[PDB]
Write a protein that binds this DNA or RNA. Structure first.
Length: 89
DNA sequence: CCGGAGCGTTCAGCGTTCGTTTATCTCCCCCTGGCACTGTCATCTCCGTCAGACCGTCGCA
């Protein structure tokens, strides 16, 4: 489990994230999911900040860092030739 | 009728203040290493192209 999650931290994401930041973001994700299934609603970032004992600015920074890139080759729709990479200057 | 005083400008003694560095002390980031009841084979793909060719492949003759 240790080696698999270490390689998941160091290799799964294209923009590499250090292992401590990976465990921080997935702990935040799992406690957010727990609060969502308990309260039945999306938890406010302030309550997440108090329950994680971190500052709200740290919480929103963590949510910002927890993203996934989108490929430049995703088609828009019916047309195959018009790409997502040709709409950005 | 030069002489002195006051005034303008310009420099040599030491006296303080800056401009730019240096090693030490907190706070944080980041990577490698530990966990000891057992727990020893996933995963859904893919169908109502399509049109015929080009080609190698392959078992029957």
């Amino acid at each position: 489990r240790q080696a698999i999650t270490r390689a998941m931290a160091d290799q799964a994401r294209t923009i590499r994230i250090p292992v401590h930041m990976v465990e921080v973001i997935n702990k935040l994700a799992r406690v957010q999911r727990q609060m969502l299934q308990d309260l039945g609603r999306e938890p406010t970032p302030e309550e997440l900040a108090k329950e994680l004992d971190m500052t709200p600015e740290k919480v929103i920074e963590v949510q910002k860092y927890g993203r996934e890139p989108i490929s430049l080759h995703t088609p828009l729709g019916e047309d195959g030739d018009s790409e997502f990479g040709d709409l950005i200057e």
